[PDB]
Amino acid sequence: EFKAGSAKKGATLFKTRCLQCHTVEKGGPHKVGPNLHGIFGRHSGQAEGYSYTDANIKKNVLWDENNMSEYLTNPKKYIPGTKMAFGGLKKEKDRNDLITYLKKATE
Amino acid sequence: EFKAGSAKKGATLFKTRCLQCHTVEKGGPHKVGPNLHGIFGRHSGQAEGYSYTDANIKKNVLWDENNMSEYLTNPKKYIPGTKMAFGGLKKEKDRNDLITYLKKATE
Amino acid sequence: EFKAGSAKKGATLFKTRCLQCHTVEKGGPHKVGPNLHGIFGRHSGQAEGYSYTDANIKKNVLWDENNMSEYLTNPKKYIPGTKMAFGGLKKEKDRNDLITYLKKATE
Amino acid sequence: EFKAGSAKKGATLFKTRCLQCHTVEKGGPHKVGPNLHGIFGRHSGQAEGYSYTDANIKKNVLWDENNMSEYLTNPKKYIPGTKMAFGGLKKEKDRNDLITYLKKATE
Ligand code: HEC
Ligand code: HEC
Ligand code: HEC
Ligand code: HEC
């Protein structure tokens, strides 16, 4: 149940918590995790060049601001068996800010 | 088609041609290429902690002495689009010796 | 470092120093060396149908006018272990003229 | 292949990735690495008071914005056997920004 926030703060959140494993630019490299360009409006596990786990592809969730917020609260609880090593942004304002940035940075 | 050979000579072949990108010990580090412990009897692209290419995971070949010999003759021809930069041991005795060592060194 | 020059002179340079081992036309044959069509903007060792050395593929240099000039000064010094038997065009005006021609002849 | 960028950002890139081993001011001290004043337009290994490796002097590359960008992508791949312990700025924008600063800071 997403509500938009500060994209400037979300940039700092992404750079500190996600940038180590992910890239956002169109046609960026796949670090530990896959490139996230065009992640919104795309099924889970459909990034070319990345070897996803069975769980990530089987979830087949069409990413949007609402299910992304649920995913980022507890990645393991949302997709059990995900290789993404991340506890989760537990504050709702954090997820809202991060997703606000991620929406523009990946379109 | 594999035939066993000199494991002492295969160690020299591995150390000169593979050691720069690969490690064999149980729980070794992932250099340019992945750690090869337990490579035999395991699917291609199933080493933990390594980011494989799309081609290497898609091949899904269960490694054995025979398909490894074919792979090491021409890695690009066997798995088209592999990031492993290696032309290939073209002599059959070289592949047999290297695989003889690699079998013991990775079990 | 690269500066454009006489493409007419570069054609004479290519025909006298490179044409024996290389072809430039789209879909030309691989003589002693590989076909050079689309060499610019492509990684080193990515020509289809040619067996490159380990050194040429491992260099993985994205060819451009600047690194080509450095390569053509001393091919062995730039890519140690290259099977290309060529000392190198030591004059800068020579490399500039040759690359000026090679840019149009291979696009 | 160099294109100019942000010298303000390049100052931050140099201070975070290079300042530990290098100094830029005219007549600065040689830390782990040599002083880089007047590095552009000078041959590799010609800084007074510094003990370079055999590989760094043997490369004898006349430094410029283009070959520096290639060097900073992968120092070991460019000069094999360099004692400079640095993986390399893999983003092109980062090399462009750093070199833009380094050009003014070392002249
Ligand atoms: C490395 C330790 C990671 C950190 C920190 C973050 N992510 Fe992650 N991500 C990582 C991996 C290994 C994977 C693959 C998951 C699998 O099991 O296959 C992912 C995946 C994602 C996805 C899904 C993409 C898709 O299905 O197409 C998303 C949306 C994602 N990661 C987002 C994300 C964000 C926003 C992060 C910071 C809060 C973040 N990740 C951190 C590895 C790592
Ligand atoms: C670095 C330039 C390499 C050299 C030399 C050798 N290998 Fe390689 N290897 C390298 C990479 C980057 C990869 C990843 C491939 C990909 O596209 O994902 C590999 C992979 C392998 C594998 C497959 C492992 C698996 O699928 O689990 C094997 C079996 C392997 N390498 C073996 C091997 C041997 C025996 C070598 C010397 C003859 C050798 N490699 C050299 C990088 C490099
Ligand atoms: C035959 C004796 C050669 C002459 C004369 C020239 N080239 Fe060469 N070239 C030759 C070989 C055998 C190879 C393969 C190198 C290897 O080790 O795999 C090459 C390769 C090149 C490349 C690299 C192509 C790529 O990596 O895709 C280039 C750009 C190239 N050759 C250019 C070139 C030019 C411009 C020449 C005349 C000045 C020239 N070559 C001469 C063999 C021979
Ligand atoms: C210490 C761990 C280093 C870091 C981080 C960086 N550099 Fe480096 N540099 C270091 C050493 C030990 C050397 C000597 C190399 C040798 O083998 O002799 C160097 C050298 C250079 C050079 C070459 C200078 C010359 O040949 O005159 C350049 C241009 C250089 N270093 C640049 C540079 C930049 C821009 C860095 C940050 C991105 C950087 N270095 C980091 C040690 C270390």
Numbering used by the authors:
A (entry chain D), B (entry chain B), C (entry chain A), D (entry chain C): -4 to -1, 1 to 103
Copy out sentences from the published article reporting this entry, exactly as the authors wrote them.
The crystal structure was solved by molecular replacement in space group C121, with four cyt c molecules in the asymmetric unit. The presence of b-sclx8 was evident in the unbiased electron density maps, and a stack of three b-sclx8 was modeled. A tube of electron density running through the center of the calixarene stack was modeled as PEG (vide infra), resulting from the use of PEG as the precipitant. The trimeric stack is ∼6.6 kDa (approximately half the mass of cyt c), ∼2.1 nm long and held together via CH−π and π–π interactions. As a consequence of the stacking and the projections of the extended arms, the b-sclx8 trimer presents four hydrophobic grooves. Each groove accommodates the N-terminal α-helix of one cyt c by binding the methyl substituents of Thr8 and Thr12. The side chain of Thr8 is flanked by Lys4, Lys5, and Lys11 each of which interacts with a sulfonate ion. The Thr12 side chain is flanked by Lys11 and Arg13, the latter forms a cation−π bond to b-sclx8. Surprisingly, the crystal structure included a PEG fragment of 29 monomers (1.3 kDa) threaded through the cavity of the trimeric b-sclx8 stack, resulting in apseudorotaxane. The polyether chain forms multiple van der Waals contacts with all 24 of the phenolic hydroxyls.
Water-soluble, anionic calix[n]arenes are useful receptors for protein recognition and assembly. Here, we describe the protein recognition and assembly activity of p-benzyl-sulfonato-calixarene (b-sclx8), an extended arm calixarene. A cocrystal structure of p-benzyl-sulfonato-calixarene (b-sclx8) and cytochrome c (cyt c) revealed a surprising assembly. A pseudorotaxane comprising a stack of three b-sclx8 molecules threaded by polyethylene glycol (PEG) was bound to the protein.
